[model samples]
Target: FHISSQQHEKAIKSYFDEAQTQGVIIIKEGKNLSTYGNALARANKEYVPASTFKMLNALIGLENHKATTNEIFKWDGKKRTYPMWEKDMTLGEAMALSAVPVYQELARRTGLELMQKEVKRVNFGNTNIGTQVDNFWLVGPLKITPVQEVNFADDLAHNRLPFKLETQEEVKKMLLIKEVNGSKIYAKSGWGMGPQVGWLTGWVEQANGKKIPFSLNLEMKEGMSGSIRNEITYKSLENLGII
Candidate 1:
């Protein structure tokens, strides 16, 4: 009933070995299907979560009354890289677009004290906010390993965090990545510029009510691309027969 055995280690290692990238994928259900490439690197490695922490950010926003699902964030008429991010949006819309500024604003509204308290309460990552309140989870000192990411996902999926269950459910709804073949995948993808890291972490819900939690994190090399996070994650899930 544990996933600590690193069961599919070979297949998982083979995939990353062939790709020539350093990464790890951890999956769990009633039992563990954990596997990885570059075991030392994956187990000890830590990196900025980039946008993946948005899940927690959204939850914190809701839990502390800093923002509501129906709350509105108006655009400042500033154009950004993504077209969808150029306009006003609600909490849900902001999350879907992964609008950095929107969530940063939400974090600023949430303030540092409450943010720090909540992150510690949930034991999120290193809990080091560094200097900036809004940007800590993005480019600052905060970091988390792939294993830690998976643990966080499992906690969220099971409503084991100290936050309100309704708050967790609301954030979970926003994380719905896809629903197919009677399985619903809820995940968040993150990429960081400095040191080049990518993350795609979340859990899957089978139509039959089984839950499979997973986390994938890897070092990104030049020309390695961003979608590799999702690509490798889905492939791993398929290999484990969870998708």
Candidate 2:
């Protein structure tokens, strides 16, 4: 764990000011760290896990054989809020697009006992999923702090999560964002409705063997552009010379 740095404060403030919303970005690479944001103790403040919960969901599904990365989920024709999610797609594709319906179905298939036990086993957030099968992480009663998000990303990155490496590897392959410069980015973006908070968290593996794990969470005003996420994240990485 490392203390906040001056450069990090400036990077967080610069981009957050442009978004007109308060936010936090924490980057940790071995012993060095940079955490910056508005207000005190924002890094530990918990928020709904949102789409980020999919990583764990995928883990549980694959580990127990409820679903495979190639499993096809037939999209219900009732129409989805996001038109891009309209058609049938595989689990990996659903993960890539953050498909709500597909994952919700997977959650139902995962059922309550396993979901509760797994959530408890992993020590995720409050470890409370209530009795609901599909909306616990999506709605409430399950929350994760930004620090927890970063730690979770690190565990997945290094195969430290409780699941077998083979199982984690499947989800890891699903998390790949892209390769740029000499590094590869593997991340998952999360967005929750109502209060409207956005999340971008994951691992950055440098070609030189350095590992940079980061978590970015920001409050978003309704109608705000999501592109702000990358602006703050990538530019901050650029500023830190991590990329």
Candidate 3:
């Protein structure tokens, strides 16, 4: 427990050498850290974003003035929406609740170019937006290193990213919505079909008033589903005293 990244590598590799599966983990401590494996059990192994890229999709919507916090999506007594619907709501409400239909619509409204620009601007997925078909931008064919994910977190904290200060701050704040055990965690998880890729990319902000941020980026083969991977990541953090 409470192992530093240096110790983490040994811990992780020991597991992999026995397991013989592809997995990665990346963890940073006080501006320095370590990685291992096909990557770190905690490092960047380049898996699909799953739904985690929705964070960026949400970001693009907010930045382009396409989404806001106050908006609400009406249910119209239906469980889902398709081909547009009689019900409607604000982008803000949809985001707060992670409303899928609204987000799908919001992603479309944000469009390819604007979303692509912001995605590249923030260095999320490193692919061309033009070549992608509709709805794909929302999910992303993107990949990120554990370090790069932390860099984005750093940009959000230090105001070095492409969006306005308030927007960045808002997104950062929203990402921190959940609390588990006694720790507060701001996170997003993703999964992609076919290649059997998955990801749980997000940061953990310790409760101390010190402004220390801990990020976890894990990618693995088909067996580690999004929920399973995220649970592993969280368990790893908790074991490491991040919580």
Candidate 4:
């Protein structure tokens, strides 16, 4: 990675300007290189994983036979943060809708023992689950920065993680948003409440069979829509000619 922006800084800065928030973008690309905003400082700073941890949660559930992508997570009739989250859904469906209740229950099944083990095995964040089995990646002590986000994403899309090939691919496909300009974008977005941080992290599988994994986080403030994360990410990737 360059000490400053190697390229696309001008174009990406315009996105931050339009969004009205200081943010960070880490694109894992050529030369085993990474380009990010706020230089390397913000890229290395840690934040909670939020729902961005869902993919791995999906993986763990699949690994232990606790859940299936198509297995139903029946709603308990309680209200949720978002309307889309209130309905019953499969693990894959819940993953897409960012349904918190399903994942929370899956976490309970995986339990603290394996959650701690798998999180550390992946070298996730500071590897601190902090005893909150169902909420570590949300409000507990678990935290990860942009760099680590990109790294895990890189390991994931490339099938380098210590999980089975089918398991990795199963969780990977759970993130497909669309195929645009011949590149398939696999990703997850997250919102951490305590510090009001927002995250969009994933990889792009280009037409040439190469994958560019990335992580972008915004310092969310009042009235900032979550969609801001996607616009900045897509726009910046376009700026870098990476879409």
TM-score of 4: 0.94
Model 1 Cα lDDT, one tens digit per residue, 78-182: 778788888989877777788988999999998988888888888988988876888888777889988789888998888988888899999988888777799
Candidate 2 all-Cα RMSD? 2.7
Clashing pairs in 4: none
1-243 in candidate 3: lDDT tens per residue? Answer: 355767755655544454445555555665765454344444544444545556667667778888675666566566564434436666544444545676666777877787677777776745555545345633445555556665555556555677777777667676665676656666655545534455555566665633334444433464543455555566566556666
TM-score of candidate 2 against the unseen true structure: 0.93
By TM-score, is 1 or 4 better?
4
- Give residue 141's lDDT in candidate 2 (0 to 100): 84
Q: TM-score for each prediction?
A: 0.90, 0.93, 0.73, 0.94
Q: Candidate 4 residues 1-243, lDDT tens each?
A: 233454578768778877878788988885374655544467888899898989888888899888877788888898888899878898888878888899999999999999889888877888899888888888859889888899989999899988999999899878997688899889999998855878999999999999999899878888888888888898878777788
Q: Which residue runs does candidate 4 get wrong by more than 4 Å?
A: 1-7, 38-40
In candidate 4, position 26 carries an lDDT of 89
Go through the candidates in order and give each one's C-alpha lDDT: 0.82, 0.84, 0.58, 0.85
Work out candidate 4's RMSD over C-alphas.
Answer: 2.8
- Candidate 1: the clashing residue pairs are 3-32
Cα RMSD of predicted structure 3? 4.6
